[PDB]
Design an enzyme around this catalytic site. Structure first.
Site, PDB file in Angstrom:
ATOM      1  N   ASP A  73      -6.159   8.274  -0.599  1.00 14.27           N
ATOM      2  CA  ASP A  73      -5.746   7.257   0.345  1.00 14.27           C
ATOM      3  C   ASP A  73      -4.570   7.853   1.095  1.00 14.27           C
ATOM      4  O   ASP A  73      -3.661   8.446   0.500  1.00 14.27           O
ATOM      5  CB  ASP A  73      -5.206   6.000  -0.371  1.00 14.27           C
ATOM      6  CG  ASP A  73      -6.305   5.274  -1.158  1.00 14.27           C
ATOM      7  OD1 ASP A  73      -7.523   5.417  -0.904  1.00 14.27           O
ATOM      8  OD2 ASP A  73      -5.915   4.494  -2.025  1.00 14.27           O
TER       9      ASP A  73
ATOM     10  N   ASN B 210      -8.840   5.370   3.029  1.00 19.58           N
ATOM     11  CA  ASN B 210      -9.425   6.213   2.028  1.00 19.58           C
ATOM     12  C   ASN B 210     -10.436   7.216   2.590  1.00 19.58           C
ATOM     13  O   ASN B 210     -11.252   6.903   3.455  1.00 19.58           O
ATOM     14  CB  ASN B 210     -10.078   5.298   0.976  1.00 19.58           C
ATOM     15  CG  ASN B 210     -10.752   6.065  -0.097  1.00 19.58           C
ATOM     16  OD1 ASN B 210     -11.959   6.307  -0.037  1.00 19.58           O
ATOM     17  ND2 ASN B 210      -9.978   6.517  -1.063  1.00 19.58           N
TER      18      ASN B 210
ATOM     19  N   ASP C  88     -11.935   8.810  -8.295  1.00 18.16           N
ATOM     20  CA  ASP C  88     -13.247   9.328  -7.825  1.00 18.16           C
ATOM     21  C   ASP C  88     -13.088  10.634  -7.021  1.00 18.16           C
ATOM     22  O   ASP C  88     -14.109  11.226  -6.583  1.00 18.16           O
ATOM     23  CB  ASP C  88     -14.036   8.253  -7.039  1.00 18.16           C
ATOM     24  CG  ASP C  88     -13.409   7.932  -5.659  1.00 18.16           C
ATOM     25  OD1 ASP C  88     -12.303   8.404  -5.375  1.00 18.16           O
ATOM     26  OD2 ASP C  88     -13.983   7.179  -4.838  1.00 18.16           O
TER      27      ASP C  88
ATOM     28  N   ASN D  74      -7.316   9.055  -5.747  1.00 16.01           N
ATOM     29  CA  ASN D  74      -8.123   8.130  -6.549  1.00 16.01           C
ATOM     30  C   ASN D  74      -8.895   8.850  -7.637  1.00 16.01           C
ATOM     31  O   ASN D  74      -9.132  10.092  -7.595  1.00 16.01           O
ATOM     32  CB  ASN D  74      -9.045   7.413  -5.609  1.00 16.01           C
ATOM     33  CG  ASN D  74      -8.283   6.660  -4.510  1.00 16.01           C
ATOM     34  OD1 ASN D  74      -8.594   6.788  -3.342  1.00 16.01           O
ATOM     35  ND2 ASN D  74      -7.262   5.919  -4.901  1.00 16.01           N
TER      36      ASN D  74
ATOM     37  N   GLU E 218       0.829  -1.188   0.000  1.00 18.77           N
ATOM     38  CA  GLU E 218       0.000   0.000   0.000  1.00 18.77           C
ATOM     39  C   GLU E 218       0.880   1.262   0.000  1.00 18.77           C
ATOM     40  O   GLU E 218       0.679   2.220  -0.790  1.00 18.77           O
ATOM     41  CB  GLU E 218      -0.934   0.040   1.227  1.00 18.77           C
ATOM     42  CG  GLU E 218      -2.096  -0.951   1.149  1.00 18.77           C
ATOM     43  CD  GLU E 218      -3.098  -0.674   0.008  1.00 18.77           C
ATOM     44  OE1 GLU E 218      -3.056   0.396  -0.638  1.00 18.77           O
ATOM     45  OE2 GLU E 218      -3.972  -1.526  -0.289  1.00 18.77           O
TER      46      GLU E 218
END
Ligand SMILES: [Cl-]
Ligand SMILES: [Cl-]
Ligand SMILES: [Cl-]
Ligand SMILES: [Cl-]
Ligand SMILES: [Cl-]
Ligand SMILES: [Cl-]
Ligand SMILES: [Cl-]
Ligand SMILES: [Cl-]
Ligand code: NA
Length: 129
Positions: free
Chosen positions: A52, A59, A48, A46, A35
């Site tokens: 994160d 997130n 959208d 991200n 990660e």
């Protein structure tokens, strides 16, 4: 802070992640590796428009507040910036809520794609724990 592998394993253990919801310590270490590459400062936007944050890339759409993710929740009740601390307490507290949410560690897409089913114990090999 960029944690050492065994260093993070020790911190995760201290903070009660080893076997939390049935996930061995190697799973958590492996997830952090893919990660954030063990970097508490890691951030990733991200598509959208959510972001994160931190060693476990938690997130902003559900879990933390960053003021810039429309329609999002703050289910861990923390500013996302808290997830960037050298101290992993906020990230661990929030990870426990996430992994209890119903899908286990499948919440972390890099865990599912890169850790799940692998020899995760390798990630804690040689660590004094
Ligand atoms: Cl490593
Ligand atoms: Cl393990
Ligand atoms: Cl927001
Ligand atoms: Cl911005
Ligand atoms: Cl909320
Ligand atoms: Cl906030
Ligand atoms: Cl820590
Ligand atoms: Cl599970
Ligand atoms: Na949010």
């Amino acid at each position: 802070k960029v944690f050492g592998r065994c260093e993070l394993a020790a911190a995760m253990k201290r903070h009660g992640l080893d076997n939390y919801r049935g996930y061995s310590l190697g799973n958590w270490v492996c997830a952090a590796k893919f990660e954030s590459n063990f970097n508490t400062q890691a951030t990733n936007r991200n598509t959208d428009g959510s972001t994160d944050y931190g060693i476990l890339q938690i997130n902003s759409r559900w879990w933390c507040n960053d003021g810039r993710t429309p329609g999002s929740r703050n289910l861990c009740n923390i500013p996302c910036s808290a997830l960037l601390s050298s101290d992993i307490t906020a990230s661990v507290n929030c990870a426990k809520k996430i992994v209890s949410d119903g899908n286990g560690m499948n919440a972390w897409v890099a865990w599912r794609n890169r850790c799940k089913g692998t020899d995760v114990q390798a990630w804690i090999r040689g660590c004094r724990l």
